[PDB]
Write a protein that binds this ligand. Sequence first.
Ligand SMILES: O=C(Nc1ccc2c(c1)CNCCO2)c1cc(Cl)cc2[nH]ncc12
Lengths: 156, 39
Amino acid sequence: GETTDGVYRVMTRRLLGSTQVGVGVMQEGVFHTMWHVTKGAALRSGEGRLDPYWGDVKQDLVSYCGPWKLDAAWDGLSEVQLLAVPPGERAKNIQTLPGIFKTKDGDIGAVALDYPAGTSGSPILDKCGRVIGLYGNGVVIKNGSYVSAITQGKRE
Amino acid sequence: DMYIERAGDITWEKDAEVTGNSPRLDVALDESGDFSLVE
Ligand SMILES: O=C(Nc1ccc2c(c1)CNCCO2)c1cc(Cl)cc2[nH]ncc12
């Protein structure tokens, strides 16, 4: 149905009224979102149907209509922008300097912004407007706050 | 059944609200895609 490049909300009518379960990025005909938002279920775009193509629970990512197209990465130094799309609220750019998730397999960028779980799948952008990762998978710190990783997929 | 509605363009907005800290945290990623704090 709607194939236009841009940010999108992922909604469901299964619960009371229409509920926003997450967000995704449409780029080069591929819809990219976080696995925990759709669970690999097919999505509807008006009259049209989007079927899953690639998914991985550990990376917590899922692509529709084609392989993962997003390949930009955080440079480790610059401030980034979270294009947050909150449930029932307008899309908003929030600039921040990411922190670090130090893991046994390497370091990952981290955005310490706090949003409801329905904001999952919101794109993190670099200075050129390129999507460097998706917001929605991270950890809860001592003060109950949420710190998400900058989750990026691999472009084949 | 899930569906998508457009929310906007993907552009950098200059003069946007600059907030949030940069924490360096020791974390672990399990087989189920769950992050956890390591101490
Ligand atoms: O709960 C959140 N995210 C999430 C949920 C379920 C889930 C995963 C991530 C991926 N790991 C495997 C299990 O599936 C969440 C997201 C945002 Cl944007 C803000 C939040 N504030 N508190 C929680 C949150």
